């Protein structure tokens, strides 16, 4: 047991990481030779498909030395910056090595630029300790962060002294929050005169060429990552020159590493067209129509939140949830267990037909659960918490909100 | 000026980044078609040479999906962890995406494990704001870090209350600090009962197969990066299970990206032989004996600190330092300006012969500086501070130390 970290990855019945020896398009092969259709896709960072040939060629060329050097600037630096600025807007752009690094740098830059101490947060922003939970819910943690769990009532209370608040930083979820929720968030932040940071590490570049919340939030600062490089190790921040002036202090040794620049330039060129996002939505929607019908035909109490871009199974019980993923594993459908499923643009007709047949076999395996009590709100809240680390949107008062926080924290 | 960051990189006389189109071994091509011999080598992270064929082959292959997937575990994960453990020791290992990320995670883990608030630091640890300077010497910054600038007197002062100290965190320099300096540091930390973290992001794996301070410091926790992947986007931490237990909270989306694992596994295989490190030392030593002679023959007051693994020009005046790099720029010798020069294993006879020839021409160009006053200690201190962000070792009393800090901060 040499590894000190605990990486999120597909794990087997003994909680050991599944070992994958090969991948192409939508398909994985594991160490036993078992073949899987991938809905996890490095938690949605594989937008194009595994071993995408154009990205792979670009990386190959860059590995030889013929497309830039790690020692310094290249034309691919300008190309990537230009593309991000065109897609996502803002005045300036910075590049980082993980979503975690990017969101931390972004929010600290805003704290410095505004001179205000608190960050009000909803959703996951990466592994850094600055996001660890406070000792007392709804109080600042040691790094001045207060999590409001996507509850706008709580947010209103936290905005009551806006001079204390550097930014509101929110990781969107388009399965569990409506457009109106976003517009209200934007309204509240504008009224309070506080900066809005959209942490689009997951959703950026995937629902559209640009930011999912470009219009809904018009954020002052954005962060993207998973959509920009077909899995390669890069992230980005952009927004106003003034709010991001503190990023002038950022430099790191691997900045000019040419394979990541080549992958990002290639992937971003494809992203800019809108085609992979359309392909994903359409493929995912087809799979969903089939899956919803299969669950209904089998009288299985499993709803599906979301849409083809990202969806999530919502089973009525934890036992059923475990059985669902067990059956999926038996059929070679690799789902990101409990979380959101993000197909890639490699989900062609052949992949879809096979995923459909496999899912019908999943529903057969689930026959013991036929006719169970339908999904209720406690299940909806528990399942949504697993993907968003806070509360799905639905009517609540403070009693209900605080009850759910006590339950789900 | 879309870029919000200010990356360290080769820059021209107007402070514009030099744009490099391609590289091969020790050589670079710029956008003008000018051909350079590289002593910068992505600040010492290109140990093997640009476009190393064996690493390139492994990277190209991994990009196709033939060696596993970014979705989860592959046997190359085990191979990289096992190689690092064999080379560097400790009980556990973690992987990160930059040196900055690794050192931050390491020291926060130690602070959590020990329950103590302060970090005592010497040297550079990356770009994160946690390392920004305090208001005054000997005062903690906002993140509990106190800089001792490599001065063991200042360290003893800070260790008067060691119950406050989670760790001492040191970035070695083997040009400006002797073996005995390290052994004293180790001694002081052990007596005080404080954890010692060796930040070997720069020096790890380059002086020897493993840590440069394996015996000198026997650190509780180590960090490496530049040596491990021929420039690719990975770093590592290792050491005691107890002190690094808090790393269980680390996960990041690109963890399984197979090209980086491929580069690390290939580079580490070569590092484990000791061959590239020896080649570097021997090639740089040959260059240095030629350069020292050339400087002496021209009566130029420029010393050279260090050795073939890493060396540094120490000119008697700033005006001469500027002229030296300007002249090297004309002859196409790319030095990391002001800092340390780190040749790669691609510095062969052909390259050395040409670098020697080119350096002779640099000496011809600096005639207007012949016969100048020889290097003094003020120059030695100023130049060393540029590479270590603290004080070179030399006899000092407390008053001299205080004055030097006033001058150089
Ligand atoms: C908006 C945003 N911003 C920034 C980042 C960071 O980018 P990165 O640095 O490139 O990875 C991400 C990275 N995203 C990775 C995933 O992040 C979440 O996943 C998180 C978290 O929700 C999820 O937490 C688990 C929870 O849902 C389960 N119900 C309980 C489990 N113990 C817990 O585990 C995690 O937190 C534990 C507590 N500290 C920790 O011990 C576990 O090891 C850790 N896995 O674990 C993931 C990280 O490990 C999302 N739900 C997912 O859709 C997403 O794909 C991001 O989505
Ligand atoms: C031990 C160790 N630990 C961790 C890391 C982090 O690894 P990474 O995240 O992978 O890069 C490194 C990364 N190393 C990069 C370089 O780190 C230093 O270089 C630093 C710093 O010393 C150097 O500082 C400059 C100073 O030497 C000059 N005399 C004055 C200049 N303004 C200043 O510039 C830097 O610091 C400024 C302080 N605010 C900042 O404004 C500048 O923008 C910044 N470039 O700049 C570099 C980083 O930007 C070393 N001198 C070098 O040998 C080395 O190769 C490391 O060496």
Curated annotation (Swiss-Prot), chains A, B:
Catalytic activity: neomycin C + 2-oxoglutarate = 6'''-deamino-6'''-oxoneomycin C + L-glutamate; neamine + 2-oxoglutarate = 6'-oxoparomamine + L-glutamate
Cofactor entry: pyridoxal 5'-phosphate
Group of enzyme by EC: transferase
Entries under Pfam families matching the protein: Aminotran_3
Family, per entry: Belongs to the class-III pyridoxal-phosphate-dependent aminotransferase family.
InterPro entries referenced in this protein's UniProt entry, alphabetically: Aminotrans_3, PyrdxlP-dep_Trfase, PyrdxlP-dep_Trfase_major, PyrdxlP-dep_Trfase_small
Stored SUPFAM superfamilies: PLP-dependent transferases
Residues with PTM N6-(pyridoxal phosphate)lysine: 226
Stated role: 6'-oxoglucosaminyl:L-glutamate aminotransferase that catalyzes pyridoxal-5'-phosphate-mediated transamination for the conversion of paromamine to neamine in the biosynthetic pathway of neomycin. Also able to catalyze deamination at C-6''' of neomycin.
Presence of keyword Transferase: yes
Protein name (database record): Neamine transaminase NeoN
Pathway field: Antibiotic biosynthesis; neomycin biosynthesis
Gene Ontology molecular functions: pyridoxal phosphate binding; transaminase activity
Lineage top rank: taxon: Bacteria
Known EC number: 2.6.1.93, 2.6.1.95
GO biological process: neomycin biosynthetic process
Gene that specifies this protein: neoN
Organism: Streptomyces fradiae
Keyword set includes Lyase: no
